Write a protein that binds this ligand. Sequence first.
Ligand SMILES: Cc1cc2nc3c(=O)[nH]c(=O)nc-3n(C[C@H](O)[C@H](O)[C@H](O)COP(=O)(O)O)c2cc1C
Ligand SMILES: Cc1cc2nc3c(=O)[nH]c(=O)nc-3n(C[C@H](O)[C@H](O)[C@H](O)COP(=O)(O)O)c2cc1C
Ligand SMILES: Cc1cc2nc3c(=O)[nH]c(=O)nc-3n(C[C@H](O)[C@H](O)[C@H](O)COP(=O)(O)O)c2cc1C
Ligand SMILES: CC(C)(CO)[C@@H](O)C(=O)NCCC(=O)N/C=C\S
Ligand SMILES: CC(C)(CO)[C@@H](O)C(=O)NCCC(=O)N/C=C\S
Ligand SMILES: CC(C)(CO)[C@@H](O)C(=O)NCCC(=O)N/C=C\S
Lengths: 182, 182, 182
Amino acid sequence: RKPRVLLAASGSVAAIKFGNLCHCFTEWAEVRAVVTKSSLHFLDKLSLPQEVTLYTDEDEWSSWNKIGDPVLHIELRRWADVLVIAPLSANTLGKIAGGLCDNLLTCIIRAWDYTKPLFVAPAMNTLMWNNPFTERHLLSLDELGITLIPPIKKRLASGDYGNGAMAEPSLIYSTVRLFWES
Amino acid sequence: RKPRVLLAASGSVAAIKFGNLCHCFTEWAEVRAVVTKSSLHFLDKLSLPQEVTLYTDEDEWSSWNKIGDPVLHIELRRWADVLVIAPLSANTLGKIAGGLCDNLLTCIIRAWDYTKPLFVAPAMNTLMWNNPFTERHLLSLDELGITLIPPIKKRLASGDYGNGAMAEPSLIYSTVRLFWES
Amino acid sequence: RKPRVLLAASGSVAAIKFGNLCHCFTEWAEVRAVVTKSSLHFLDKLSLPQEVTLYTDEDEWSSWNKIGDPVLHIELRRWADVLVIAPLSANTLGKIAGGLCDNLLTCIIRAWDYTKPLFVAPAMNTLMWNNPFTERHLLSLDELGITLIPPIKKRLASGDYGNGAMAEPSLIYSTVRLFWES
Ligand SMILES: Cc1cc2nc3c(=O)[nH]c(=O)nc-3n(C[C@H](O)[C@H](O)[C@H](O)COP(=O)(O)O)c2cc1C
Ligand SMILES: Cc1cc2nc3c(=O)[nH]c(=O)nc-3n(C[C@H](O)[C@H](O)[C@H](O)COP(=O)(O)O)c2cc1C
Ligand SMILES: Cc1cc2nc3c(=O)[nH]c(=O)nc-3n(C[C@H](O)[C@H](O)[C@H](O)COP(=O)(O)O)c2cc1C
Ligand SMILES: CC(C)(CO)[C@@H](O)C(=O)NCCC(=O)N/C=C\S
Ligand SMILES: CC(C)(CO)[C@@H](O)C(=O)NCCC(=O)N/C=C\S
Ligand SMILES: CC(C)(CO)[C@@H](O)C(=O)NCCC(=O)N/C=C\S
């Protein structure tokens, strides 16, 4: 009954389409959003659905004062039926592949119950995307079982035109929906 | 004559028992403590032994103004006969495995004279502990020669009950003591 | 006609010789500098050539306000014919090997067009240099095709005397020059 979907934004310029992405899921599922500090540089709070709760790192160090209180990264990991990171920056990709967790989003990933699906939609410039570490990290996510929603060939924020643009919201949406109903 | 023991705390909620941990070593050895910024969220200065000097990242960028001055992370690495990190967060674990050093504790580890013993007592939620990166990183520490003091099955700060709680101070203490006297 | 050389400084105490390093290149090439936040602890702006433009992380989040604006890390990657990091700290070395990018310098590396040469001059204490991760990371840079300019045996900022001091500016300069003219 109304699947819980955790949507997340990383520090990619593509984060400007995050509000719209949340809109694609709202009717179908109960949505909660998580963003990194850098994503707040491209994300516009008012562009998100009003029904969507936005969590930041500060929410981590606030929902807990003394033992016994809830641990947000754990609370969200449990609450969620699925996790979608769109966009996923090269930086966050590398932290995931490195087993690092220095913020709310990465802590959720580090404690992620892999029985639940986790989708990522990478977004970065072509050179960063073509860089060898990208494939290295993607290979790692595959091993973890994370599902990749490949970037498309659009007009990058850097003027040029090539691979690296984030997948379109509709595709991200249908991909997650088709899997769930399977 | 009175071994020098460097005790360290990472950003795990278990850091609340750090003062007590220092107490377990004070009589047997000369103790100096090192903590990460996040550990200061769970650590209570007044709970530590008065004879214990606490070093923070700020102490790094203070003991040095111009060439010729001492480099704290190096000064501590030399001073210490042994290093004990309890608790060791998943984040710090990953930085160690990644050869990273962006703070006092990690810089000490990065420059650690592995002729000297280094013990770690991991502390994190069960899912984070059960996460595949954990084992990956533990494997790396093993190669480096670091000694693992496994977490126990207690009642986590997240309410649930499972593996991931930090080893008890007494065990951490006896483990380090038994090795030394060998 | 006047090759574009991007010179970069990391958080090594050796960064105090960065201004002089820029001077070694100024006559031969058009120089632009990039520095990390920590490098600013050892770098003296007034010691650099006046003709040298210095870029910091803040320049990233300033040259861009809305879509369509230039992305500095990409703009610099394109502009540059070669990249030289001297000094390269153990921390930045590890971020490079980890495919991480959380600042201007690392983002440039992450998006680096490897058709262009990239040289690094590591600088760190002997123990950090002798640490096993160092070799591990150097091995990775080799695979990427990055050219290592080994550290020398001088008197470290830590008083002792051993390997780990940054290569001398003249050598860094001649190394880059000899390659270019080949
Ligand atoms: C204008 C601009 C656009 C950027 N675009 C991207 C991008 O598309 N993908 C990416 O991975 N990083 C991009 N970066 C770099 C990231 O913001 C940077 O690596 C950051 O530390 C990522 O933070 P996060 O890992 O918390 O998301 C951009 C930076 C700026 C200033
Ligand atoms: C209330 C709360 C409790 C936490 N408990 C743990 C824990 O037991 N183990 C862990 O590895 N991280 C834990 N985290 C996440 C870390 O604090 C976070 O990854 C941090 O960046 C670690 O910093 P450090 O690597 O400098 O220690 C907790 C966070 C909060 C807000
Ligand atoms: C006085 C002093 C000197 C340092 N010297 C070095 C050095 O030679 N090499 C190194 O890798 N780190 C050195 N460190 C540690 C780095 O500054 C630290 O790892 C930092 O986070 C690196 O930042 P960066 O990766 O942005 O350059 C030193 C720290 C201090 C306080
Ligand atoms: C930015 C947007 C959403 C505009 O339609 C699209 O181009 C995109 O997703 N691009 C991928 C990231 C990027 O451009 N990076 C640029 C430098 S690292
Ligand atoms: C917190 C304490 C010391 C109370 O006795 C004990 O439960 C413990 O070491 N737990 C391990 C870490 C943890 O609970 N993480 C929770 C979420 S990441
Ligand atoms: C600092 C300088 C430039 C003085 O001539 C020289 O010794 C040097 O490059 N040393 C390498 C780094 C170092 O000393 N690290 C010390 C602790 S991590």
